[PDB]
Amino acid sequence: TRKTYTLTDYLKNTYRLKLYSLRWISDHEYLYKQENNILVFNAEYGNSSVFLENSTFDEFGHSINDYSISPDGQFILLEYNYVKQWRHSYTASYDIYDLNKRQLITEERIPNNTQWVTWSPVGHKLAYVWNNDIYVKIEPNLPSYRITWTGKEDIIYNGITDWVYEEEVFSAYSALWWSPNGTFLAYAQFNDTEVPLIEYSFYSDESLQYPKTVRVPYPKAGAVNPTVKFFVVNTDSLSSVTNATSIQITAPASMLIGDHYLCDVTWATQERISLQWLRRIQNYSVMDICDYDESSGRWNCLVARQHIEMSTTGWVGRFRPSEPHFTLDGNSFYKIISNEEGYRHICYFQIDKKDCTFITKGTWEVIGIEALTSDYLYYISNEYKGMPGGRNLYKIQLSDYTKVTCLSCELNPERCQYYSVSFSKEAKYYQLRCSGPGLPLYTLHSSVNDKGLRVLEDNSALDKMLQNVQMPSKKLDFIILNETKFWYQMILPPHFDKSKKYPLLLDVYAGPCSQKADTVFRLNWATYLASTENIIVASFDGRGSGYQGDKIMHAINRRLGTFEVEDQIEAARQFSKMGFVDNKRIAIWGWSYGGYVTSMVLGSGSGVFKCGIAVAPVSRWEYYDSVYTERYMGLPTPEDNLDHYRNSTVMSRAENFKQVEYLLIHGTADDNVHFQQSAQISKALVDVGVDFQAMWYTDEDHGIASSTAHQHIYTHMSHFIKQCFSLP
Amino acid sequence: TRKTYTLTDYLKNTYRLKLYSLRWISDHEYLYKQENNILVFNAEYGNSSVFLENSTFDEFGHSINDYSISPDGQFILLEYNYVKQWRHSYTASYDIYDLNKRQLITEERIPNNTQWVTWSPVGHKLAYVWNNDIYVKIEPNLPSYRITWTGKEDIIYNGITDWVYEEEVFSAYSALWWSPNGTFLAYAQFNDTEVPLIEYSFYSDESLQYPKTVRVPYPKAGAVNPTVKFFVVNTDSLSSVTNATSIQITAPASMLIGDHYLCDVTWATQERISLQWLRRIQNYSVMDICDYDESSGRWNCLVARQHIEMSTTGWVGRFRPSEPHFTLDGNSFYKIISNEEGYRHICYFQIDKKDCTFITKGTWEVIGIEALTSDYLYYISNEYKGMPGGRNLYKIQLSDYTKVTCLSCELNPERCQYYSVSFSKEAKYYQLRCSGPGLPLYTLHSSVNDKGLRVLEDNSALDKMLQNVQMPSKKLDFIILNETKFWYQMILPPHFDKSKKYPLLLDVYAGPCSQKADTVFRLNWATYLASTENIIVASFDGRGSGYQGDKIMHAINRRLGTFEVEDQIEAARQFSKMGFVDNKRIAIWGWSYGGYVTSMVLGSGSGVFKCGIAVAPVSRWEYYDSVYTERYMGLPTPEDNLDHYRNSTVMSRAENFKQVEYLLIHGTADDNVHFQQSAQISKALVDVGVDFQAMWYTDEDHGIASSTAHQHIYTHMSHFIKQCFSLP
Ligand SMILES: *[C@@H]1O[C@H](CO)[C@@H](O[C@@H]2O[C@H](CO)[C@@H](O)[C@H](O)[C@H]2NC(C)=O)[C@H](O)[C@H]1NC(C)=O
Ligand SMILES: *[C@@H]1O[C@H](CO)[C@@H](O[C@@H]2O[C@H](CO)[C@@H](O)[C@H](O)[C@H]2NC(C)=O)[C@H](O)[C@H]1NC(C)=O
Ligand SMILES: *[C@@H]1O[C@H](CO)[C@@H](O[C@@H]2O[C@H](CO)[C@@H](O)[C@H](O)[C@H]2NC(C)=O)[C@H](O)[C@H]1NC(C)=O
Ligand SMILES: *[C@@H]1O[C@H](CO)[C@@H](O[C@@H]2O[C@H](CO)[C@@H](O)[C@H](O)[C@H]2NC(C)=O)[C@H](O)[C@H]1NC(C)=O
Ligand SMILES: *[C@@H]1O[C@H](CO)[C@@H](O[C@@H]2O[C@H](CO)[C@@H](O)[C@H](O)[C@H]2NC(C)=O)[C@H](O)[C@H]1NC(C)=O
Ligand SMILES: *[C@@H]1O[C@H](CO)[C@@H](O[C@@H]2O[C@H](CO)[C@@H](O)[C@H](O)[C@H]2NC(C)=O)[C@H](O)[C@H]1NC(C)=O
Ligand SMILES: *[C@@H]1O[C@H](CO)[C@@H](O[C@H]2O[C@H](CO)[C@@H](O)[C@H](O)[C@H]2NC(C)=O)[C@H](O)[C@H]1NC(C)=O
Ligand SMILES: *[C@@H]1O[C@H](CO)[C@@H](O[C@H]2O[C@H](CO)[C@@H](O)[C@H](O)[C@H]2NC(C)=O)[C@H](O)[C@H]1NC(C)=O
Ligand SMILES: *[C@H]1O[C@H](CO)[C@@H](O[C@@H]2O[C@H](CO)[C@@H](O)[C@H](O)[C@H]2NC(C)=O)[C@H](O)[C@H]1NC(C)=O
Ligand SMILES: N[C@@H](CC(=O)N1CCn2c(nnc2C(F)(F)F)C1)Cc1cc(F)c(F)cc1F
Ligand SMILES: N[C@@H](CC(=O)N1CCn2c(nnc2C(F)(F)F)C1)Cc1cc(F)c(F)cc1F
Ligand SMILES: *[C@@H]1O[C@H](CO)[C@@H](O)[C@H](O)[C@H]1NC(C)=O
Ligand SMILES: *[C@@H]1O[C@H](CO)[C@@H](O)[C@H](O)[C@H]1NC(C)=O
Ligand SMILES: *[C@@H]1O[C@H](CO)[C@@H](O)[C@H](O)[C@H]1NC(C)=O
Ligand SMILES: *[C@@H]1O[C@H](CO)[C@@H](O)[C@H](O)[C@H]1NC(C)=O
Ligand SMILES: *[C@@H]1O[C@H](CO)[C@@H](O)[C@H](O)[C@H]1NC(C)=O
Ligand SMILES: *[C@@H]1O[C@H](CO)[C@@H](O)[C@H](O)[C@H]1NC(C)=O
Ligand code: NA
């Protein structure tokens, strides 16, 4: 008989999905690494040529982590000595290789322990951050110009983000932005001087006699936040005799009145930059549009070009105000904003006009704007078939908004319902990436007549292997709760039989603007649980979930740990009533926000769940970071929202855990959700005499992603679930 | 019929063991608390009176934690605001109450956060330590005199010990010693300037937003040790001079050549003090006897009065050099030292003669010297019936060493074999404290004729209760290995049937000079396991154990983690071959040194044990403190014992844990065995892919003794054991 998808298959990646990650280098060619050799492809015909031999660096001496070819293709940046920091940050050493003279540059090399590096968008200038300061190199072999001198570890950050800005605002370590042709280099400077530090132990190798104490500026809810300044420097007028002059662009008065954040930076033209600022109370944001003045050499932001964005029901943007997409001349722009019905759609703005015009509408949402030409704007939305968990590419005619054309919907409706896209330089070509419900499919297309040029990768090899495996199926459907439809998905065991009762595991995340019910194909722990253990793994998107309008998303505003937790209990209650579910064997598990919800659910006293697993959960909002927490909860002060901060903790529900089996897991070096959060949960449970299972992972962070720990946690959780379900 | 001793009975202390804690205030009167009242008893007739009514401090405004009456009975020290620190240390607030004028003193009060306070041995002077400096009050209501000005938190300690001296050398927080009539105050000063700090998080109450980092000067093996200095100040001159001089007494040249410790301070007469020093390599100790020179106001120590104590086979003393007991004139003293045969006996020394005379001998050992009069020396030994696990009080005639009388052996041989004693001020009366094998029994005796005056507490109430419970029985015996006997004890289930096969739990400690096989009566976890779960709980005293001569005790010298581990494994083999043990169900558990032995045993690959529980175990000796570790292991350097230090870790046996079920438990605030020790064990197990169970206890230290955590850990361990033995 055919085998099933086993835990080992998941842990050792027996069945790998093939990808096709290309890098556009112009409007008609892209780079693709094959056999460790970098090839250059012509999009039109599909022909290629070798761009760089894999042997080119046989005696390099170091293991190359990654590479980056300059925009003009004259040089290649080689990254090595990679050392990871937080989610996006890391340091590394770099070397530059001249592709023309086929030589490795040995003079004025980028320093070791460099924190970030980037070529200008055009040409081959380089900007890098080292020791928290910004340096610029006009030529790979020439000495660098020091741009800033205030860089100081854990205090002043120039051109790179501090912990909270990296994690919650920019989702990037870099805080540098080259103007379109590379003339100017804008950058932010963060000051964490008064930000309190989180401290935790790091044990390191067995050989370290005394544990190390890691200390990082981390503002918990309501604590002092870092401050921010924004500068722009002209890199075409740098001197090796005089220090570079950075021009500051100050935030508008409506922002300077109190705490605020810099949340977006987007160049509109060679001499016009837009900046969006957000108040610490995240329901008011301001976009400034500034023009360079050759006369004074300053940047002026006319008030007439200011655009305000606010929310009366919640915060601004999905996680942060959306980015503007400027037209060629920079006189107008398109941006996704919630309309009057609470659905996110594309609005068209005049830079000096207050009112914008919505170009799309309907009870669905635009996920993102992907390309803009003078005749069409391309975007991805979940409009097709009214499925919020599906994604397709559309283009809209800018001269007639009633002319909307779906470009991916009908390519292969049964195999492909969740698309992502990558356009070439001038949107002449685009790569479509289908990630579900069938196996991932990568295709190349031409924009002029939307021709389907060819298939880049169809994963036919994986398809052949999976035919010999008893794979689970996925059901995507919805339930009605108070006239509103909420979607859920179920990973069903092979040969599913509706006349039998299956144990059920509810997989939950449920953070604000999240989506767990979708059409994406995945090979993960749930695949194994369904395929080998015959467990149904369900996920449900309730109030607070995204992509279905603010009525649903903002339902949890100032109220985390309420509706989203109740909705997961309601879903399980519904599921428990279905004929194929064993109501005596229903469990729940989650990681991060999902660990919090799982814990809140288990301590709700609903009596629906037999057991649950919480991995690295938040336990009380006052322990989590300010930017994320305050966005949904406001401030933890008696005059604002302190009462709800105190009523939404896991600890307060400790006694309700007496009737469930609970497994609490957490990495000791978790810099994101501090171990402290689980330490307080266990202490509260010990205090009320409730027994439970626990597991700490020494020196693991929020991902508990090292190879050995990854295998161990899933192995441990599998034994727990099977034991809870009475499975061999 | 007849209930068993359940887990709840143990955790709720339903069967209360009564004791009789009295405080001698003179040669014939003692204080005893009865119904929150403090009574004063006349030893001779047993009649009493109310010394301090319970309603005396009903309006004190604070809960009085403890009290202390001045030697002259004129004042009472009231301790409150008790805040615990390490094993012996704590801070508190104090008030002094005038017993005569029955009035509480309100002027010149002892400061809050006082680290230590002690009355002079005579009268009512007081010496206290506050902010690491010593202060003396001649009168309770008068201002204090500052003795030191160097005190500095975590750096300089005057009159109090640092962490390592408290835990391993003195077993006490105080480092000051009043001379017999209170004229002089001697004290030690510790300097931890270069001692590395152990740092760990303390989460505290849920209300604390950021965890606190606890930092404690703690020397791990081979690290920089604190240095020490000794001083004596004449307190009688305090009111005559502005700043009384603290005369330093320096260690001898033999000690100053390298790192060393001050290990004992004992006043001999009003003007003679003895000090014992120990080299960092703990097999060489020196005792200096110093006399006050009234002409120079200095203290001189004549080399002819110096006594050397060294060891060729191990360290000096059981845990440290033994204390001297001086005759009244201070010209000679008695001290326990191991004889040529390796057994610890009492030796009689002339202060200026190097050769001593042994006054006791035999293949047994003297446990301690309890009292010394002009005619008799009283001591406790395990000579009776050749049982190293028994304890009796003996009296030897100082004028005729052949005249030795056992004062407790035959009092009640069946019920009493483990005695402890408490003599009145001049040894006129003594309280005997029998702690096993039967119920504890407390009695009063007159030394003049060694007649029993009366029974103070016989625990008849508890005996009445226990008759309604199926209690387990205890067996104490030995097995012969290599021609030498090794003792063990077994807690046997009620109605034990040698024809059946019972599951077996080996309870282990096994640290150097320890003893787990004794005649003490206990109501603990094992009582429950044997009584309700019908599990035999055994303990074995193999190589390294104490009170049986140096041949056995010093067998583990420079070799921890070898013979004592092997001997526990062999003990299990010998037990299984007794015929009433189920070879398929043998477990092992231990706390502290016992956790290390348990882990080493489970990782030996012996195949003898099915499962095991290690609580707060040591995992690698370089992580534990210098004083304890180096005493047995020497220094972790290539020139000394590094190889054995690297060969005796739990981590190197990770792979073998694949053969057993392991539960690892550790308190996160353990200042003694750092959580780091279990953090490295779990990491090594994850790295080799071994599954196991774990449990951390938030903010608990090495004793995991808070009421809720105590109940939770034993409940957790009971489930693990029951599951391992298939005991639903
Ligand atoms: C990038 O754009 C900048 C700004 O438009 C160009 O710089 C200007 O060039 C003109 C000459 O054509 C000068 O008169 C201006 O003074 C320059 N402005 C500044 C701020 O320097 C620059 O030449 C462009 N670079 C490229 C490669 O096209
Ligand atoms: C942004 O949200 C805040 C807080 O929800 C709003 O400010 C006030 O908040 C307090 C409670 O924190 C309420 O009592 C007030 O009624 C709220 N409004 C005002 C004007 O004080 C604020 O209004 C929101 N901003 C926008 C544009 O909706
Ligand atoms: C215990 O009783 C004795 C004797 O009854 C008390 O000691 C004193 O004994 C002498 C002679 O017997 C009497 O003259 C005294 O009057 C007794 N003292 C007192 C204070 O009355 C002794 O006081 C009693 N001890 C206690 C603690 O109550
Ligand atoms: C405690 O020991 C430290 C040495 O570890 C002493 O500190 C040194 O003192 C000398 C003399 O004043 C200075 O020159 C050095 O710079 C100090 N070294 C360090 C590391 O601080 C200190 O004096 C001792 N304290 C006492 C009260 O004895
Ligand atoms: C009492 O005497 C001691 C010892 O001389 C004084 O302590 C010295 O104080 C000076 C000045 O502050 C320091 O330079 C020395 O290092 C200290 N030595 C010691 C051993 O502490 C103390 O200051 C005197 N107290 C008063 C009130 O004069
Ligand atoms: C406590 O002992 C001390 C030390 O022997 C006594 O002080 C000595 O007293 C004699 C008088 O007999 C003097 O000659 C010495 O000068 C004192 N020496 C010192 C260092 O002070 C003291 O008298 C004794 N206390 C009591 C109450 O007897
Ligand atoms: C892809 O194929 C085209 C042929 O259509 C290649 O030809 C172009 O470039 C050649 C050299 O790069 C020239 O010799 C040809 O004249 C030119 N032809 C046309 C019609 O432009 C092209 O180079 C190939 N591209 C790659 C990446 O191999
Ligand atoms: C970073 O922000 C700090 C916080 O305001 C600035 O420091 C100011 O406040 C300090 C106390 O926190 C004081 O020492 C000074 O009055 C003041 N300036 C300095 C240098 O401390 C600090 O200047 C800012 N640094 C930069 C580079 O912007
Ligand atoms: C950054 O550090 C590297 C590594 O030390 C330096 O490169 C050389 O590394 C070799 C070992 O591979 C050493 O023997 C050399 O001493 C290092 N220095 C040199 C000049 O070769 C590198 O030089 C450092 N980079 C910078 C910009 O200082
Ligand atoms: N810290 C959160 C970050 C996040 O949700 N993304 C980062 C910011 N972001 C996202 N999507 N867009 C953006 C950005 F545009 F703002 F960058 C999602 C994730 C997160 C939430 C928790 F409750 C928790 F316990 C842990 C945790 F890691
Ligand atoms: N640190 C040890 C202290 C001790 O064993 N007593 C303290 C010193 N002592 C004793 N008996 N007499 C003395 C003294 F006289 F030296 F004070 C025993 C105990 C101990 C040993 C370990 F291996 C461990 F992992 C933890 C632990 F707490
Ligand atoms: C590229 O290099 C790899 C080794 O890194 C080698 O196995 C492969 O054959 C090379 N590819 C080609 C096309 O030569
Ligand atoms: C540039 O500024 C730094 C720091 O302010 C200063 O030390 C350096 O000398 C300056 N260089 C020049 C050329 O002015
Ligand atoms: C509507 O349904 C929601 C949950 O979907 C529930 O909380 C609410 O009480 C219901 N009634 C109204 C008026 O919203
Ligand atoms: C003393 O106080 C206790 C309270 O613990 C009370 O029960 C007892 O009766 C009191 N006895 C006297 C003599 O005051
Ligand atoms: C101790 O502290 C308390 C509370 O702060 C204060 O009321 C009292 O006066 C202090 N006592 C002394 C002796 O300083
Ligand atoms: C003391 O111990 C050291 C270390 O083993 C040893 O070399 C030395 O000879 C010992 N001294 C004596 C007297 O045994
Ligand atoms: Na095609």
Coordinates of C-alpha atoms in Angstrom, one line a residue, chain A residues 354-453:
Chain A
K354 CA -7.3 67.0 -0.5
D355 CA -10.0 64.7 -2.0
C356 CA -9.0 61.5 -3.8
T357 CA -11.1 59.3 -6.2
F358 CA -11.6 55.6 -5.6
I359 CA -10.9 53.7 -8.8
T360 CA -12.1 50.3 -7.5
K361 CA -14.9 49.3 -5.2
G362 CA -16.9 46.3 -4.0
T363 CA -17.2 44.0 -1.0
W364 CA -13.7 42.6 -1.4
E365 CA -10.2 44.1 -1.1
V366 CA -7.2 45.2 -3.0
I367 CA -4.2 43.4 -1.4
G368 CA -1.5 45.5 -3.1
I369 CA -0.6 47.6 -6.1
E370 CA 2.0 45.8 -8.2
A371 CA 2.8 48.0 -11.2
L372 CA 1.8 51.3 -12.7
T373 CA 2.1 52.4 -16.4
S374 CA 0.5 55.4 -18.1
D375 CA -2.4 53.3 -19.3
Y376 CA -2.8 50.6 -16.6
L377 CA -2.4 50.0 -12.9
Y378 CA -1.9 46.3 -12.0
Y379 CA -3.0 45.0 -8.6
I380 CA -3.8 41.8 -6.7
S381 CA -7.2 41.4 -5.1
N382 CA -9.4 38.7 -3.5
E383 CA -12.4 39.7 -5.7
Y384 CA -12.6 36.4 -7.7
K385 CA -15.6 34.3 -6.7
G386 CA -15.9 36.3 -3.5
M387 CA -13.2 34.2 -1.9
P388 CA -11.3 36.3 0.7
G389 CA -8.6 33.6 0.9
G390 CA -7.9 33.7 -2.9
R391 CA -5.6 36.1 -4.8
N392 CA -5.6 37.1 -8.4
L393 CA -3.9 39.7 -10.6
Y394 CA -6.0 42.4 -12.3
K395 CA -5.2 45.5 -14.4
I396 CA -7.5 48.5 -14.6
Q397 CA -7.6 51.0 -17.4
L398 CA -6.7 54.4 -16.0
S399 CA -8.8 56.3 -18.6
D400 CA -11.9 54.1 -17.9
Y401 CA -12.2 52.6 -14.5
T402 CA -15.1 50.4 -15.6
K403 CA -12.6 48.4 -17.7
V404 CA -11.1 45.9 -15.2
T405 CA -9.5 42.7 -16.6
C406 CA -8.5 39.7 -14.6
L407 CA -5.2 38.4 -15.8
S408 CA -4.8 35.2 -13.8
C409 CA -8.3 34.0 -12.7
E410 CA -8.9 31.7 -15.7
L411 CA -5.3 30.5 -16.4
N412 CA -6.0 27.2 -14.4
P413 CA -9.0 27.8 -12.0
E414 CA -8.8 24.3 -10.4
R415 CA -5.0 24.3 -9.7
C416 CA -4.5 28.1 -9.3
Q417 CA -6.4 30.4 -7.0
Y418 CA -3.6 32.2 -5.0
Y419 CA -1.3 34.4 -7.1
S420 CA 1.7 36.6 -6.5
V421 CA 3.5 38.6 -9.2
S422 CA 6.8 40.1 -10.2
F423 CA 7.0 42.7 -13.0
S424 CA 10.1 43.7 -15.0
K425 CA 11.5 47.2 -14.9
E426 CA 8.9 49.0 -17.1
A427 CA 6.1 46.4 -16.6
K428 CA 6.8 45.0 -20.1
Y429 CA 6.8 41.4 -18.6
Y430 CA 5.6 39.7 -15.5
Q431 CA 6.1 36.5 -13.7
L432 CA 3.0 34.9 -12.1
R433 CA 3.6 32.6 -9.1
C434 CA 0.6 30.4 -8.2
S435 CA 1.0 28.9 -4.7
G436 CA -2.3 27.0 -4.4
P437 CA -4.6 25.0 -4.1
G438 CA -2.6 22.8 -6.4
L439 CA 1.2 22.6 -6.6
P440 CA 3.1 25.9 -7.2
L441 CA 3.2 27.0 -10.8
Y442 CA 5.5 29.7 -12.1
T443 CA 4.8 31.3 -15.5
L444 CA 6.1 34.2 -17.6
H445 CA 3.9 36.7 -19.4
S446 CA 4.1 39.7 -21.7
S447 CA 2.1 42.8 -20.8
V448 CA 1.2 44.2 -24.2
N449 CA -1.4 41.5 -25.0
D450 CA -1.1 39.5 -21.8
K451 CA 0.4 36.6 -23.7
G452 CA 1.3 33.5 -21.7
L453 CA 4.9 33.1 -23.0

